[PDB]
Amino acid sequence: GLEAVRKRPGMYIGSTSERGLHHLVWEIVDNSIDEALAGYANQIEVVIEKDNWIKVTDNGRGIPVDIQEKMGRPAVEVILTSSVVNALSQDLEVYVHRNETIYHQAYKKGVPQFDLKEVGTTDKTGTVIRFKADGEIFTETTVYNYETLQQRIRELAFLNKGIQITLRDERDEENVREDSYHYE
Ligand SMILES: COC(=O)NCc1cc(-c2sc(-c3ccccc3)nc2N2CCC(O)CC2)[nH]n1
Structure with a gap:
């Protein structure tokens, strides 16, 4: 089912070009926005990391x-192994804070590298997704454009007032840029 994505990606994502690359971000973010719309999340952060993770x-x-x-798998694994983003990522990581526990799993091309495991304790709740788009699939470019992410972020915040959405570019550690939107 998921190899169907990696072989016919545009049938799911829409082209493998730059707009396709940025579609990935919006798929994860839209999901975080759902968490906000369901009334639980009020802080969303997007970071462009070294290597364009x-x-x-x-x-x-x-x-x-x-x-x-x-089948006996954690729901999160069940969900992630149906994620197009996961499928189109050469590496994807998840960290869930739930039940004062931090749970972690990693994937390659949508394939779980190991079982979900507890890697810490926490007094927060929420989700962290880190993914690195597949170079094999997004030829043409794997470099995110800041302006493009920023404009969409801003609309998304204005669409969802009261939700703080932060974008941050860390691809240059000596010169780090951040914009944070929070509309009343
Ligand atoms: C797969 O990566 C993401 O989509 N990350 C963003 C995200 C998603 C969620 C939650 S919390 C939750 C949830 C649902 C029921 C009860 C409690 C929490 N469900 C989700 N989504 C639902 C849609 C799926 O595609 C991804 C997971 N929190 N942050």
Whole structure:
């Protein structure tokens, strides 16, 4: 089912060009926005990291991790192994804060590298997604454009007043830029 994505990506994502690259960010973010619209998240952060990794953080409830009765996998693994973003990423990581626990899993091309495991304790809730778009699939470019992300971020915040959405470019550690939107 997921190899179907990696082989016919545009049928899911729409071209493998730059707009396709940026579509990835919006898929994860839209999801965080759902968490806000459901009334739990009020802080969303997007970071462009070295290597053009992308990180997205919200403080919603965190993707569920309970064993989803049917195959015996944590719901979050079940969900991530249906994520187009995961499928079109050469590496993807997730961290869930839930039940005062930090849960972690990593993937390659949508394939789980190991079982979901607890890697810490926390007094927060929420989800962290870090993914690195697949170079094999996004030829042409794998470099995110700041302006493009920023404009969409701004609309998204104005569309969802009361939700703080922060964008930050860390691809140059000596020169770090951030914009943060929070409309009353
Ligand atoms: C896969 O990566 C993301 O989409 N990350 C953004 C995100 C998603 C969620 C949550 S919390 C939750 C949830 C649902 C029921 C009860 C408690 C929490 N469900 C989700 N989504 C639902 C849609 C799926 O595509 C991804 C996971 N929090 N942050």
